[PDB]
Structure formats: structure tokens, C-alpha cells
Design an enzyme around this catalytic site. Sequence first.
Site, mmCIF file in Angstrom:
data_model
loop_
_atom_site.group_PDB
_atom_site.id
_atom_site.type_symbol
_atom_site.label_atom_id
_atom_site.label_comp_id
_atom_site.label_asym_id
_atom_site.label_seq_id
_atom_site.Cartn_x
_atom_site.Cartn_y
_atom_site.Cartn_z
ATOM 1 C CG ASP A 281 -1.256 4.874 -5.375
ATOM 2 O OD1 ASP A 281 -1.181 5.921 -5.275
ATOM 3 O OD2 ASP A 281 -2.704 4.952 -4.813
ATOM 4 C CE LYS A 283 -2.557 6.079 -1.644
ATOM 5 N NZ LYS A 283 -3.363 7.548 -2.288
ATOM 6 C CG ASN A 286 -2.371 2.635 -0.809
ATOM 7 O OD1 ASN A 286 -3.534 2.910 -0.122
ATOM 8 N ND2 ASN A 286 -1.857 3.282 -2.192
HETATM 9 N N1 LIG Z 1 -7.792 -6.743 3.187
HETATM 10 C C1 LIG Z 1 -7.892 -6.310 3.761
HETATM 11 N N2 LIG Z 1 -7.932 -6.421 5.197
HETATM 12 C C2 LIG Z 1 -8.648 -5.108 5.429
HETATM 13 N N3 LIG Z 1 -9.104 -4.163 4.951
HETATM 14 C C3 LIG Z 1 -9.230 -3.680 3.984
HETATM 15 C C4 LIG Z 1 -8.083 -3.890 2.905
HETATM 16 N N4 LIG Z 1 -8.253 -4.007 1.867
HETATM 17 C C5 LIG Z 1 -9.157 -2.698 2.396
HETATM 18 N N5 LIG Z 1 -9.013 -2.487 2.851
HETATM 19 C C6 LIG Z 1 -9.608 -1.343 3.747
HETATM 20 O O1 LIG Z 1 -11.004 -0.744 2.642
HETATM 21 C C7 LIG Z 1 -10.055 0.387 1.897
HETATM 22 C C8 LIG Z 1 -10.627 0.560 0.585
HETATM 23 O O2 LIG Z 1 -9.593 -0.173 0.094
HETATM 24 P P1 LIG Z 1 -8.822 0.165 -0.957
HETATM 25 O O3 LIG Z 1 -8.354 -1.447 -1.516
HETATM 26 O O4 LIG Z 1 -8.040 1.187 -0.714
HETATM 27 O O5 LIG Z 1 -9.836 0.933 -2.391
HETATM 28 P P2 LIG Z 1 -9.903 1.642 -2.676
HETATM 29 O O6 LIG Z 1 -8.586 0.888 -5.187
HETATM 30 O O7 LIG Z 1 -11.229 2.171 -3.698
HETATM 31 O O8 LIG Z 1 -8.678 2.528 -2.894
HETATM 32 C C9 LIG Z 1 -9.132 0.700 2.942
HETATM 33 O O9 LIG Z 1 -8.625 2.100 2.706
HETATM 34 C C10 LIG Z 1 -9.070 -0.117 3.642
HETATM 35 O O10 LIG Z 1 -9.332 0.819 4.863
HETATM 36 MG MG LIG Z 2 -6.962 2.894 -1.474
#
Ligand SMILES: Nc1ncnc2c1ncn2[C@@H]1O[C@H](COP(=O)(O)OP(=O)(O)O)[C@@H](O)[C@H]1O
Ligand SMILES: [Mg+2]
Lengths: 493, 493
Positions: A281, A283, A286
Site C-alpha cells: 500500500d 502511495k 501513506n
Molecule cells: N504517526 C502519525 N503522525 C501523525 N499523523 C498520523 C500518524 N499516523 C496517522 N496519522 C494521521 O491519521 C490518518 C489516519 O491514519 P492511518 O494509519 O492512515 O489509518 P487507516 O489505517 O485507518 O487508514 C493519517 O492519514 C494521518 O493523517
Molecule cells: Mg490510511
Amino acid sequence: RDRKYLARLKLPPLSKCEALRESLDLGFEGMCLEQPIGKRLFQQFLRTHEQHGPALQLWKDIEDYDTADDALRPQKAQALRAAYLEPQAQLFCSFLDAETVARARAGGLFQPLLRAVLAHLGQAPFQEFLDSLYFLRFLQWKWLEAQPMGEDWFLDFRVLGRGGFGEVFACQMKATGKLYACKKLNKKRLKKRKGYQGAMVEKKILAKVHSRFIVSLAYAFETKTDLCLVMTIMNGGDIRYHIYNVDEDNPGFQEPRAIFYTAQIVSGLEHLHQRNIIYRDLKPENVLLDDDGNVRISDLGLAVELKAGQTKTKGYAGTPGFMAPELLLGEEYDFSVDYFALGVTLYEMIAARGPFRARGEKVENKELKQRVLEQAVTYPDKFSPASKDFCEALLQKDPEKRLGFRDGSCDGLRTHPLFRDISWRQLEAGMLTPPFVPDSRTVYAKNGAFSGVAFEKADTEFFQEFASGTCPIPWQEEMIETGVFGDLNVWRP
Amino acid sequence: RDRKYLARLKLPPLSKCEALRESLDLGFEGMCLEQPIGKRLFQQFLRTHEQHGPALQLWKDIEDYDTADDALRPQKAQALRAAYLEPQAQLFCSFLDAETVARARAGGLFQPLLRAVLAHLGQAPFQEFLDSLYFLRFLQWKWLEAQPMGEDWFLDFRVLGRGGFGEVFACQMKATGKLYACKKLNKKRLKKRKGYQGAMVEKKILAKVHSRFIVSLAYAFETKTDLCLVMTIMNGGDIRYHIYNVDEDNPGFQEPRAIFYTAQIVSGLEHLHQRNIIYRDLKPENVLLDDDGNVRISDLGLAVELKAGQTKTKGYAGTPGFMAPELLLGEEYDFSVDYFALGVTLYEMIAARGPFRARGEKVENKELKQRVLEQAVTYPDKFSPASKDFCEALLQKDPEKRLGFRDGSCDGLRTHPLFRDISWRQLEAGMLTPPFVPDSRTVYAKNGAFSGVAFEKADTEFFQEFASGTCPIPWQEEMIETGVFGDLNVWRP
Ligand SMILES: Nc1ncnc2c1ncn2[C@@H]1O[C@H](COP(=O)(O)OP(=O)(O)O)[C@@H](O)[C@H]1O
Ligand SMILES: [Mg+2]
Ligand SMILES: Nc1ncnc2c1ncn2[C@@H]1O[C@H](COP(=O)(O)OP(=O)(O)O)[C@@H](O)[C@H]1O
Ligand SMILES: [Cl-]
Ligand SMILES: [Cl-]
Ligand SMILES: [Cl-]
Ligand SMILES: [Cl-]
Ligand SMILES: [Mg+2]
Ligand SMILES: [Mg+2]
Ligand SMILES: [Mg+2]
């Protein structure tokens, strides 16, 4: 440092560590090299034992050489050889074999020498460490590492983003003051959408990998309503936001900035691929920026860890437009799918659109599939000759012809003309200055909500297993970084 | 510090201390109060554990009060009460019983409080110390204490005196630089003159007693030709020399100087008598001065240790003119014989002759016996009223009427008008300034020689038992005093 919680960080009596002594992996590499507090205590042991002074100092001097500025490395190389390798040197390292001493004086300089030093230290000196107070002190730190540090230890103070099962918060570990991101996964929603397996894969991977190019997991715990992953805070936004939403009239990145992120992403991919993990994944959205401007890959719920002796896997997963032909064709695949996704990601960083669809162009799945399988990507003028070749090499339909992971690394890929001005030693060590630094005052994020079930033992046991607690390496880094290690590891205050 | 030997002082791996863990006496008083390195490590343990801060500080503050100048004690008493005993005090000692807190605030002030503090520390805190790294470090120091430190570790550089079986040398412990006296006993001569039992009694007593008023034994070892006792260096000469040989035309001491030595000798006698030992050879020549002018009793080869439940002994031993009537009469006797000898010693310090014989008067043993048994001592004008009464009380023929050891101490004796200007707390603590300070350039000693046999297993085994090695308390004092403890007890250098 909230004092209530800081006060719970206290070293135990030695009797409490006896179970740990039997259950822990106490191998040399795992304890004295990989675990920061283990390494600190082993070096303290070596420092207090005269016999081991030369070896300790050579070790430190090689590690310093490895992260030195190019301007100072010739000096450091001459000083090292004069101190440890020349015939009658005051800290001549008698334990080294003649070949290794000879190799070290001629002309990853000192990487063979480092291997030899570490091989030496893992024998008699390690055995002596195990028979020292410093090993017992390590066990006391491991006991503390294992104590309950759950929801009460963290202060959520700001929403960083929204995921599929909950918000991600900026939070503070109350005892140390360290800032983290806390990703919350609503239990009811996870259950409803059958998201357990994905949640667990992300947790397990982030726990086991340790790379400056992948978000690190420090804690996993549960509350009444949520599973929680406390990880590296990435305050700089995501690459998608930066491509499109900062300079909206002129989206995309200049080549050097795109190339720098590519180099970092490649390093993160390599780290997964060396551990037999396929990301599936990659992109722009991410890839997250920190407040220095360095990036890490994140969002590991679609990843797959290949089994021991497993060279390839099967299964439809990923994001449309980033999935490689062999995946779409339902064939067996390996790490190659991630390199396809890297080409798409670079393409978008430069072009501000994907390779298969124009802006606003929305097509049937079948049409997008036919384009990814059969259509030749075209490249505007924006792409330099090196950028196009690199993308072309990554977007190859046949994975056997595709650029990627070869001979256990991405070294082949690193030599590509795209990376001409990248110094890989300094990139991999996090020394290079990023081309873009996010503004601390600025929030690099976008500004609708979605529309009950009792839990059974099967659910609650899963939540309990998920909530594995504290990850050793990040926790030890935290303790050292925030000064708590120094404060508690006092002998005569 | 000779570096060859200093280099042999290194702490062992913990596996080497496991036998010691089983064999040593590891009681609270013996380890954490009496042994200086044990006490230092226990206090370091308490200092690093917040819970025990109040208790540790109160302990230290009582010990400081006990050796404070009279001018500062009222201050120190007020500060202690305000810090630990008043209702809402910041270091209020919750563990103390109400009686003890109440007693401590009213009006050996704090001696009950000290007993209570030490009783507290000997329970839970001691148990926690035993389960700490600091206890293991104690064991490492005890292992080092037990290693061979024999003839090669000492440098003999000057003759201090001559005894019956050999010379006594000024010597230096090579590793630490500490100056000692080394008393040598020639093996062949000891055997010839059947001196084994006497040599062993002196060794055993000097090893087991710990008093600032008795020469301390630090090491016992053997060479090919000699048994050796390394003990406190007393560079100031002996009382006999000082009575007669410094100011030869006007021999004897001024009353205050004589009284000061008497007070010190009394304190040393008390220490022996509390340990059920009878000295049996107090006389001016056996009382040695150090370079500060403080005295100690020495020459313990005629001493007898009364058995458990033994109240009295029998046996003809001592020096003619110092032996009490009951000894001469062949009766049972106890500590009283030493007080008789003290009266003779004081008499001589003031008069520059003994109580029973004029200068040059040499009599048959039978005549001297009749004089000691029957003759009333006469006292010149030189004796103040207090000096005469004191001597009279000590020279009483009937031991039942003689001044001495009563109710387990010499406190009764201390109250005698002789000691009006002596502050006993400061005397017993070695705080008082002596009335005479020996000159370092001056040798306070007098300026003929005496005229072969194979050794058997019985002899060599005796020599081996005699050579018991290092005495714990003096060795630990040496290590601390000379800086070696500080240097080796580093944790993070
Ligand atoms: N380590 C982090 N630091 C800051 N923001 C984060 C971090 N991890 C995620 N985010 C924010 O939260 C959002 C959702 O997290 P994500 O891991 O992509 O969730 P999902 O698995 O539900 O897609 C991300 O798109 C980002 O904006
Ligand atoms: Mg995500
Ligand atoms: N600790 C000491 N410091 C300095 N001189 C000493 C010490 N012990 C003994 N001497 C000197 O050596 C002499 C002989 O020692 P001593 O113990 O009296 O032997 P002995 O038991 O043979 O009489 C003493 O008279 C004194 O001069
Ligand atoms: Cl140790
Ligand atoms: Cl696309
Ligand atoms: Cl400890
Ligand atoms: Cl006499
Ligand atoms: Mg996800
Ligand atoms: Mg003598
Ligand atoms: Mg003697």
C-alpha cells in the site's frame, strides 16, 4: 514530566527479575547491540574494565567515523589507524587477526573491522558482562519496561488525522514528556467491519521493524472503547497534502525534493523486504513528513509477512492505480509489487496526477485494470531523462524485468542516475538536510461523519492479545532521550 | 601507590563471590554498621531509594551531633528536632514510635533515638538492601579483602623498635601507600622459647578488638623466617621513654598530661574488659604514642580471654611491680588486676619511680612480693589531692575494695575528681587535643644482640593458622582512607 507517573518509574529489587532472567532472549546481538539500554550498560561495563578499553574505544571510533561529515572522515581514518592498528600503537588491538588489521590499514571502510571487533566482544567480554552488576541492572530496566503503561500514562491533546476506525491524536507520555501519535481503533467498528486481522498485522509489523524510514510502534494498549497504537509523531503532514494542497495553483514537487523522498521511501521498502514483508500500500497519502522534513512510510494494515522459505504470495489487496499487473492478474508475487507502487508515487509527486488517469477521469475498474495491464505510460516534459528512465524501470509490466529488490538489497537501484546528487551513507543515517522543512505553526492537513454489539470472550481475548504493551527498543530510546535513564541509573548520588 | 600491587585490587565477577555469600556472617549490625565498606554501601543504597531518605538523614545527623563541638550542639539539636520530630516536619520520621519521638524532643541525648532508627533500618530497609546491587557489590569487596596480601605487599623502611622475637619496622602497604608498623616474630626463636601460645593470643585479641585506644591489627602473614603482624603505626615513642628520656634532669609528667593518658588507658582497659579480656601487662613501656600525641595500649601476649560464663581466672603472669596482690597470692582474679597496674602506671608518670622501690633499689622477688602485699604506698607532694585518692583507690590490696570495672563499664571511675577537666565524650571520640605533640623529626626511642632447628608439620601448621591474613575492619578503613574504595566503586566513569 507529570510527577505521579514519573514516580512509578523505579527500579525493582533483584528478586523480582528472576522470571525475566529465564524468559528473555539474552543473546549478545539482541541485548548488547540492538537494545539501547543494553548497549549503554555493556559499554559502561567495558569502560570500567581496563582490559576492554582498547576494544570499546575502537568500537566507538568506528561508529563515529560512520556518521562523520565527509570533510572529517580522512582525519578520523588516519587517527583510528594510528591509535589501534599500527605496530606499537598505545591502544593496539591485540585480539584482531592479522588479515583484519592489514585490511583495515589499506584503502564501508572499517566495516570488516567493525564485524571483527563485535565478534570479539560477543565472546569473552560478553560472558564477563553476564557475570557483572551491569547485566543485573539491565534486567531491572527490563522489568520496568514490562510494567503496565496503558491509557492512564498518555495525555491526548490534539487531533492529527482521521482513519477508518478512529482518530489519530497527538499525545504526551506523562512520565517523560515525550510526544507521540496515538492511533485509535474503535472496537465496535473494528468488529462490525471485520477489521481484526488488518489491525493485528499493522501492530505486529510496526513492532518488529526498526527503521528511521518507517513509523515506529512504542506502545500497544486497550481502553473500554478502543485499541491504541502509540507511534512516532509525524507532524509535517502527508506527501499527498504537500503535492496538492500547499501551492494549489502549481501542484507537484521540484525534482530534487521528489528524488529525496523517493530515496527515503526506497530505504524503508528495502528494510521491509529484507525482513520478508511486502507492504502492498505505498502511495503518497501513506508517506508522512516529520517536523524536520524527513519521511516515513505508514499504514501497514495491508502488509503481508512471507513465511520462512516463502518466496512469493497470493491475494488481491491494495489501492486501485497502485496495484501491479501480476497482482491484478491474480498471479503469485513478491516484493516487486512495491516497486511498481513506487514508480506510481514518484510519477504523481512530479506530475500531480497518476500515470493511468487524467484529472477528473473516473473509469470502471475493468478499464483501469486494462490500462495498468496494457497501456504504455506517457511522460510530460516535467520529467528529466533520469526521472523517466527510473519510472519506466519501475512501471515495467513484467515483474521479472522490473527494477527493485535484487541480491538481498536495493543497492542496484541506488546506483541509478536519478540518485546522482544523493549521498546514500548520509541519507541512510538521517544526516542529510531535507529540501523542504514544514512550518511548525502551519497544520499540513485537510479540514463528514459516519453513521451496537455486545462483545464476547473471543473479542475480548483478541483485544487483550493486541494490547501487547511496550516495545523494547522505542521504550529504551525514550528513557534515554528524555533523561530518565540517566536519572535512575545513578549509583552514588 | 606502587602500580604493580595497586593493579591487583580489582573487583571480581559475581560468580566468584558465591562461596562468600554462604560462609560470611551477613547480619545487619556486623555488615551494615561495623564494617566501613558495608556501611558505605548500605547508606548509598538508602540514598538512592526515596522512601529511606528521612531515615538515612536522621541517622547521619545523630552521628554528626555525637561528634560536634559543644558550641554547635544546641544548634544541631534544634535543627534535628525541627527536621524529623515536630508534627508536620518535611522529613518527619513516620516509622518512629510516639514515646521515642516524645523522648527525643525533651531535654547521650538522641542515643535512644539512634537505637530506634537503627532498629528500623535493620528490618525492612536491610531486607531490601540484601535484594539490591549494593549488597552484591559488598560481596565483591569481601572477595577482594580475602585475596592474598602477604609479604610482597609491604615495604619495610625503618626499625621502630626491638621486641623479644624480632624487630618492629615502619612499613608501607605498596598498593595504597598506607603506613603501618610490622612486628616480626622469628620462627626459630619462637619455637626455641616456646612462644607460640603468647604470639597467638596477641594476634587473636588485636584482631577481634576495635578501639581507638588499642593498636589495631590489619594483616597477619608469614615469611620463610618470620610471623608478621601489621598494625597501627605509633611513631611517638612509649610513655616510659617520655617519662625518663626526653627531659632527663626533670623526669615525670605534669598532672594534666598524666591525667589525659590515664583517661585514654582507662578507655582502652574498658574496651578489653567489656569483651571479657584481662590485659595483665599494663605498664608505661606498653603504652605507645602516635604522631598526634594520642596513646594506645599494646603488647597483648600475656592477655587472657575469659570463657563464656567465666567470671574469674587463675595464673601467674605479668611484670614484677605491676602484678596485683590477688595474682601474687595465687587466688582467682578478674579485671581488677588491670586497675592495680593502672595505679602503678599513673604513680610512675607523676613520680618518675614506682610505688614500691626507690631509684636503684633492687630487691629479692620475695621482698617485692611482701611490699606489694603488705606495704602502704606513700605519696610525695607532687601528687595533688585528686591524684593521691585515685592512686589509693586503684592500689587497694583487696580487689573487692578496689576501684575499677563496675556495672559493665568504667563510668563510676570516670566521675572521679581526677578527671574534672576531661570531657569524656570528646576524649572517647578522639576529638580532644593532646597536651603533648611529638616532633616528627625527633625519634622518641633508645639507641646489645643475643646469641638452629628443623620445622615439622606441627610447626608449619601453627604458622599457617597464625597467618590468618587480612582483618576486615582495618582493611576496609584503609581502602576508604587511601581513596581506593572511591576509585574502584565507580559505576559510570
Ligand atoms: N504517526 C502519525 N503522525 C501523525 N499523523 C498520523 C500518524 N499516523 C496517522 N496519522 C494521521 O491519521 C490518518 C489516519 O491514519 P492511518 O494509519 O492512515 O489509518 P487507516 O489505517 O485507518 O487508514 C493519517 O492519514 C494521518 O493523517
Ligand atoms: Mg490510511
Ligand atoms: N605499633 C607500633 N608502632 C611503633 N612501634 C612499635 C609498635 N609496636 C611495637 N613497637 C616497638 O617495638 C617494640 C617491641 O614491641 P612489643 O609489641 O612490645 O614486643 P614484645 O611482645 O616482644 O615485647 C616496642 O617496645 C616498641 O618500641
Ligand atoms: Cl560488576
Ligand atoms: Cl492513475
Ligand atoms: Cl539495586
Ligand atoms: Cl616499684
Ligand atoms: Mg490502514
Ligand atoms: Mg614489649
Ligand atoms: Mg609481648
